[PDB]
């Protein structure tokens, strides 16, 4: 079983100091940590430890002896030795001196099958990137116009990524990876043996041990010890930097960054050597110095460089805040970095947000993160009434306008106080709307105005939020069970107490461990008020990983009972009070939400083509507003959205616990300081405990805050009589204002004029904000005539800058989930490919790069092998033949291979039908000479694997073809099922059924067991059905690595599964060596498919095969789709030039004009006319009937009769098979049924945080126009051909490129080709099969309605 | 006789005395009519008053509040 | 009669008369309040504008004190009426 | 005896006159209740508040 | 003539009547003693605050 449940390949855990203390001082290992350094462990006594722990410390004491046997001078005491013993932020300046290159042969055959690989692929790769260019285009410069300098193919790719700096060093820490990973493994099985390995290179001696590493340089004499985490860190940064490095090396548009990314690391890395955990804090203040030089480019002078001289005052401070640096070596270390980050364009400025993970992280004490937590809480703070009312009063108003513009343009249920003006009373009567020019006015109206109960909210509304784990914390007593036993153990042997009872249970668990669970009751902890007599409750923080700022270290965790109320609470904030407020542009739709962003951000960009509008970008940092919430400043929000709902008491929770209960950064490695401190209570506000807490919680109650601060904006902007649109979120706040200015006034004044509009609004807002009790400093406020940010993305002059490198820093050789199979590894780097398209980074280099990492990955796992395999036949077959290697990791995913990323994805994101879109794939690389035409044969005559008819349904457009579904998914279903099978909530009562299985099978039988089979609507109709909807709710459960360890373990995997779970990899090998090998002797009718042959054609006879035993012959209608690239003969037309398919026949086309005279970054007056781009078109009835406050369980009836009929038959025997199914999730009559199902015509059949598709620098002044064609798979078609030929336009001027000094224009001919072709469906189809005997939960609310009609 | 309807002269000339006295009773009514409408003030700020203090109250940490239905 | 007809007149008219008389004063009373509560009006200004201006402070736990001294606060959700009700 | 009619005639107007008039003092009578009336929450509420003060 | 006799009877009686109302508006005095106090009291309490 531990072959599954295998350490940590990534850092997923905060950096522990004191566990490397722990490990450290355990064996006596040696150091020159002053006393301060250890804190509470130099006070432990350490002989007892030592004394349990016999294997540990045999090991350390082993370490220690080779240490002391290598290195003599390391007996010396005193620091009289010429060894240096640092710590991890110590060794930054070091790590390329640890080489390990000889005594280490694994990365050398892992480097060289790489090259041998890539070898044989790279020029079909670029012959293919020439094809699609041509077929494009119709020019052979697409992709090099940008560049021509170098062209990089995937050979110059390997070699530069081999042969660069860091190279040596990610190899040696991949070694170093492996090897503890290795021991790791071991000591679970409980070996006991050979568990310390030496590798001693010369010059760089390193030990690894399952708990640590010990590694010395000779040439700088520097020993340091590192941990698991920490060795993870270590590699991950490495990696990061190679690729940064390597990226900027390859790419002519990163290519300026190299040299000053390399400069910075060595001054931060000099830096580190000097200050230590502290040089993080520079750090944290470059990604605010980025947008400080954005800024330090806008045309207003009152507002340039303020920003920049105080991140420059900030990190003086920082470097002379230990007295490290004088005031002269500050100011020059100063200059230095800032030297790098200047004479840059915009986007290589926003660029450099990827050097933040590329110094590693800080090491975390629960002390010093408990420190802030304590002095951003339990501190005085002054607040204003009035600043509290006005901002009520103009909560109600939006609230009451929230209402309406909903529920039929009526006021909610309110009554009016005594003051209320005949004017309000009035505007209640009429029910009209309320003018925020009237509320900024008798605010002591609009307020003290009772909402009363508009709601009908209920706690079992949604199912999953229950069905999420989230961290527990142990109840208030055994509150010390998170620590380490041995440091706590001595503390309670002279307390004459019981050791605690160590805490595990998870709240996905206990929840679904419950026999009697009722939301109603769940509420009633904080409703009755028994929260603030509950002896049990505990609250603690534990540190958080991947931060390096010192806020937000921190994430904390409840008891069961108050974390169930919190999310139901969250739940109804957001289900129906929440969407009453919008003067918020966030939504949870991201099409919009860019749309939204794009016409903020071109709000002032008006050309040439009277009075003009201006634009000025205010961006505030929301981070510390959680803990300077305070209980005044919620409690009349409060306590009207409480009355909305109809509860007496539950918002108003966090503060009103908080103040009553003693909070602690729960570590195990940081036990208290004091050892007679041993209960909670009675805690002092110093060490680890932060004493009555009067703030709030990061994610608590944050719907509550976001409308309190949205109110406060809309407060400021009617105050300052100025239009502005706010896009406020949790943790950071756009706000565009707007003013109007004269039309023929200069760009430069008409900002001036833009700003001195702002400014008022802005101090209004500071006073807003300051009246709340949340001061604003200016490290969260930016000012900006240009840009503003959102999303960690910014948003500068109708564009959205690149930040590509910090994607690619986070490309490594693994991914984290169990599993670790090379298909979700090399998915993993395809989407990450995808990024690096979607930001900016030549498409030609992108494709390169995805080839390369794919074989890259695949000969990693080869190898190094995670698990030893009795028999390496397969493993032996597929390293002496890189032939086999390229021809694998070039095979789409979806006929077996690893290439997950498409031509086609390069440029739209929507692809429809995977296979065909493979299928052209495959075509490419065979007519360029990648692969061979055998291998499609071969494919094609594979012989069909092992599907049932739940498996065609349940996932449309996949062939019947084995081990196309990853382990990962396999133990996300295991863990599922464990749960479900052992869940005993009564909301989980009738979901799981010991007949699920056969249920879906001949539920799938029927709807697919037709005179033609149409997967499509099946798949729609097992998702609506009763079944379906237990699959989903089934499909809700988390399935996190520690349930899946749970789930392995309460319920252990049978020995042949545990092998094909531990094996999936050497299987999937042996697998696809049939079609990868040689030409098998295939079916003859096969040679009428050739390359020539459509995809969509091979698509069809390739679906027809390989579900063969299934269907029999019969065809399957409904899944294919063009292939984007295929569908369109784009031709470029410039100066002279003309179309030739327009000129030969072809008509049909979708016509793109790129006007001339775009200059970026420059005056919108010379420029064209921008405009909000096409991102793209999400779904957008007139059923017999609207019925409104239709239950789930409700419209998924109407869908499924409705695609019943729409594809099956408009029989009345058709009839009678939709009823029938829709009854498995209804109680309507055949009647209410077929009048209130939806149109059955065009049923669009369509079913299953923040990455923008594009900058939109030139898609912002494209024309688009698809008069000259036809014109739901014909939108989806033309919906993609239009984003194609935006991103061809983007990348025919990629980001290099500033400027457009002629009019192109594109006509990208979609007609004259082989993919389109006439749809035809509808006909009628008996079932071949009697009704399933469909076992339905009746009683279940989630599944079934007994009353869905009033 | 003579006598007499110089009576009824008296008579008359006092009743008509009457109107003038009652005059003024009458317009000191006006005082009234503003001192009503002021009222009206008087209670808006009153009761703006009363919600504010009673607000503050209200927002005392310590002790929890309940709202009436 | 016409005796009747004066005599009783006068009588009753002596009694209007000094019904008059009170009624005048009453009148006086009248002008008084006015200005008593045109004064109570300016007062009423300054209260209402100085409790526009105030501060709430939360003191917080600076002193450290332990919770268990600190707990000097009703258990108890009480309904209490705010604004209109 | 004509002129003592008409004399006669006058007071009757001088009546209605007196009638008309006082009905207006009935009038008054109307708003000092209502205001009394008034006032009267007012030294209610305010004394109301005098504990919530202190 | 015997008639207005009678007639101011009538009339005289209902200044009879009128004086009965009347007497009721001095009542009114009660409350402005009262409004009176409760100032003086709010001042007295105001005094506090301030
Ligand atoms: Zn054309
Ligand atoms: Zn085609």
Not at chain 1, 706 to 734: C, F, K, Y
Not at chain 1, 796 to 818: E, F, P, W
Not at chain 1, 915 to 937: E, N
Not at chain 1, 1055 to 1064: D, G, P, Q
Request: with cysteine; proline share 5%; aromatic share 8%.
């Amino acid at each position: 079983l531990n072959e599954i449940l295998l350490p940590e390949v990534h850092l997923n855990s905060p950096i522990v100091r004191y566990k490397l203390f722990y490990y450290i001082l355990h064996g006596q290992l040696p150091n020159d940590l002053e006393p301060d350094d250890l804190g509470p462990l130099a006070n432990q006594n350490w002989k007892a430890i030592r004394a349990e722990e016999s294997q540990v410390h045999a090991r350390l004491k082993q370490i220690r002896v080779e240490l002391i046997a290598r290195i003599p001078s390391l007996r010396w005491t005193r620091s009289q030795r010429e060894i240096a013993i640092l710590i991890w932020p110590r060794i930054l300046p070091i790590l390329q001196a640890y080489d390990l290159r000889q005594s280490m042969q694994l990365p050398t055959v892992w480097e060289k099958l790489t090259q041998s690989t890539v070898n044989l692929i790279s020029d079909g790769l670029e012959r293919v990137v020439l094809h699609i260019s041509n077929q494009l285009t119709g020019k052979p410069n697409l992709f090099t116009r940008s560049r021509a300098y170098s062209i990089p193919s995937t050979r110059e790719l390997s070699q530069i990524w081999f042969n660069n700096e860091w190279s040596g060093s990610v190899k040696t820490w991949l070694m170093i990876k492996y090897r503890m990973r290795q021991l790791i493994t071991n000591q679970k099985t409980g070996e006991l043996t050979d568990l310390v390995t030496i590798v001693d290179t010369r010059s760089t001696l390193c030990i690894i041990t399952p708990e640590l590493v010990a590694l010395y340089s000779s040439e700088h004499k520097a020993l340091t010890y590192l941990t698991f985490e920490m060795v993870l860190m270590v590699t991950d940064m490495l990696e990061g930097r190679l690729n940064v490095s390597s990226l900027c090396t390859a790419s002519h548009y990163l290519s300026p960054l190299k040299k000053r990314i390399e400069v910075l690391l060595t001054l931060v890395d000099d830096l580190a050597l000097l200050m230590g955990d502290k040089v993080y804090g520079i750090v944290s203040s470059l990604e605010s110095f980025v947008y400080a030089q954005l800024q330090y480019g806008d045309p207003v002078i009152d507002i340039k460089g303020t920003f920049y001289g105080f991140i420059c005052n900030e990190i003086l401070d920082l470097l002379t805040e230990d007295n490290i640096f004088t005031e002269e070596e500050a100011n020059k270390v100063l200059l230095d970095l800032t030297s790098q980050f200047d004479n840059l364009s915009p986007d290589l400025t926003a660029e450099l947000l990827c050097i933040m993970r590329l110094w590693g992280h800080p090491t975390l004490t629960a002390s010093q993160a408990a420190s802030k937590v304590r002095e951003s809480m339990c501190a005085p703070k002054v607040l204003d009434f009035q600043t509290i009312m006005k901002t009520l009063a103009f909560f109600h108003a939006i609230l009451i306008n929230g209402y309406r513009r909903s529920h039929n343009g009526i006021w909610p249920p309110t009554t009016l106080h005594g003051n209320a003006p005949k004017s309000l009373i009035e505007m209640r009567h009429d029910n009209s709307e309320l003018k925020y020019e009237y509320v900024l006015k008798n605010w002591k109206s609009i307020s003290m105005l009772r909402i009363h109960k508009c709601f009908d909210a209920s706690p079992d509304e949604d199912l999953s939020i229950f069905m999420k784990d989230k961290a527990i914390s142990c109840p208030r007593q055994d509150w010390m069970g998170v620590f380490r036993r041995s440091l706590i153990k001595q503390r309670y042997r002279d307390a004459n107490r019981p050791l605690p009872q160590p805490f595990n249970r998870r709240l996905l668990l206990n929840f679904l461990e419950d026999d009697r669970f009722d939301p109603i009751k769940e509420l009633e902890y904080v409703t009755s008020g028994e929260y603030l007599r509950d002896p049990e409750f505990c609250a603690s923080y534990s540190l958080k990983e991947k931060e390096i700022k010192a806020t937000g270290r921190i994430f904390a965790k409840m008891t069961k009972r108050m974390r169930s109320c919190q999310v139901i609470a969250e739940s109804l904030l957001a289900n129906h009070a929440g969407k009453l407020m919008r003067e918020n542009g966030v939504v949870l739709d991201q099409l919009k939400l860019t749309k939204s962003l794009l016409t903020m951000n071109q709000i002032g960009i008006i050309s040439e083509h009277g009075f003009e509008i201006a634009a000025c970008f205010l961006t505030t940092d929301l981070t510390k507003y959680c803990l300077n919430w305070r209980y005044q400043v919620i409690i009349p929000f409060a306590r009207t959205l409480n009355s909305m709902y109809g509860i007496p008491h539950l918002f108003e929770w966090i503060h009103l616990r908080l103040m009553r209960s003693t909070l602690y950064v729960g570590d195990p490695f940081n036990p208290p300081s004091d050892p007679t401190q041993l209960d909670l209570d009675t805690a002092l506000n110093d060490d680890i405990f932060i004493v009555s807490p009067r703030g709030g919680i990061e994610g608590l109650c944050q719907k509550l805050w976001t409308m309190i601060s949205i109110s406060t904006i809309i407060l400021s902007a009617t105050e300052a009589n100025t239009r502005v649109m706010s896009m406020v979120q949790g943790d950071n706040q756009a706000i565009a204002i707007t003013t109007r200015v004269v039309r023929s006034l200069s760009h430069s004044e008409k900002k001036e004029q833009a700003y001195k509009a702002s400014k008022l609004f802005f101090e209004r807002l500071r006073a807003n904000n300051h009246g709340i009790g949340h001061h604003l400093k200016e490290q969260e406020t930016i000012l900006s005539s240009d840009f503003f940010i959102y999303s960690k993305r910014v948003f500068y002059k109708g564009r959205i800058l690149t930040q590509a490198l910090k994607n690619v820093s986070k490309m490594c050789l693994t991914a984290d989930i169990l599993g670790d199979c090379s298909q979700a590894s090399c998915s993993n780097l395809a989407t990450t490919v995808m990024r690096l398209t979607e930001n900016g980074v030549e498409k030609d280099l992108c494709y390169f790069l995805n080839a390369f990492m794919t074989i890259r990955q695949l000969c990693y796992d080869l190898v190094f092998p995670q698990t030893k395999s009795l028999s390496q036949d397969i493993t032996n077959a597929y390293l002496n033949h890189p032939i086999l290697i390229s021809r694998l990791c070039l095979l789409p995913s979806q006929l077996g291979g690893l290439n997950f990323l498409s031509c086609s994805r390069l440029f739209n994101r929507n692809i429809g039908d995977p296979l065909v879109s493979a299928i052209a794939d495959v075509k490419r690389l065979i007519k360029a000479g990648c692969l061979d035409i055998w291998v499609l044969y071969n494919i094609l005559g594979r012989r069909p694997g092992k599907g049932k008819w739940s498996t065609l349904a349940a996932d449309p457009y996949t062939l019947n073809i084995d081990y196309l579904v990853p382990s990962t998914t396999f133990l996300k279903k295991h863990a599922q099922y464990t749960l479900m099978e052992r869940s005993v909530n009564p909301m989980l009562r009738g979901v799981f059924s010991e007949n699920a299985a056969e249920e879906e099978e001949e539920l799938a039988q029927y709807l697919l067991d037709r005179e033609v089979v149409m997967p499509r609507v099946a798949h729609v109709i097992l998702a609506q059905s009763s079944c379906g909807r237990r699959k989903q709710i089934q499909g809700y459960l988390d399935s996190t690595r520690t349930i899946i360890r749970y789930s392995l373990e309460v319920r252990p995997l049978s020995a042949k599964k545990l092998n094909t779970v531990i094996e999936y990899n050497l299987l999937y090998l042996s697998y696809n060596l049939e079609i990868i090998e040689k030409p098998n002797i295939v079916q003859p009718f096969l040679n009428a498919i050739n390359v020539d042959t459509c995809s969509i054609d091979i698509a069809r006879s390739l679906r027809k095969l390989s579900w063969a035993t299934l269907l029999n012959g019969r065809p399957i209608e409904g899944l294919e789709t063009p292939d984007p690239i295929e569908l369109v003969h784009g031709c470029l037309i410039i100066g002279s030039d003309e179309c030739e398919h327009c000129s030969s026949g072809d008509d049909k086309f979708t016509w793109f004009f790129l006007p001339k005279g775009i200059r970026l970054d420059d005056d919108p007056a010379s420029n064209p006319p921008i405009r909000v781009p096409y991102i793209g078109s999400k779904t957008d009835v007139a059923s017999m009937a609207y019925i409104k406050g239709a239950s789930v369980s409700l419209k998924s009836a109407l869908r499924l009769a409705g695609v019943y009929i729409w594809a099956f038959g408009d029989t009345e025997e058709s009839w009678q098979d939709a009823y029938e199914l829709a009854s498995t999730r209804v109680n309507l009559t055949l009647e209410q049924l077929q009048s209130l199902t939806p149109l059955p015509t065009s049923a669009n059949l369509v079913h299953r945080k923040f990455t923008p598709a594009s900058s939109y620098a030139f898609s912002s002044f494209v024309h688009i126009s698809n008069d000259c064609q036809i014109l739901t798979d014909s939108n989806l078609i033309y919906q993609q051909v239009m984003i194609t030929g935006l991103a061809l336009i983007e990348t025919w001027n990629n980001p290099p490129i500033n400027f457009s000094v002629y009019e192109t224009t594109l006509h990208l001919h979609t007609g004259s080709s082989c993919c389109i072709r006439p749809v035809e469906s509808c006909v009628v189809n008996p079932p071949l099969l009697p009704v399933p005997l469909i076992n339905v939960p009746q009683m279940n609310k989630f599944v079934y309605d007994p009353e869905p009609l009033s | 006789a003579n006598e007499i309807m110089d009576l009824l002269r008296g008579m008359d000339a006092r009743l008509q005395h009457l109107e003038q006295k009652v005059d003024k009773v009458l317009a000191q009514g006006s005082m009234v009519t503003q001192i009503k409408n002021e009222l009206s003030t008087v209670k808006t700020t009153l009761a703006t008053i009363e919600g504010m203090m009673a607000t503050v109250k209200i927002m005392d940490p310590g002790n929890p509040t309940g709202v009436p239905v």
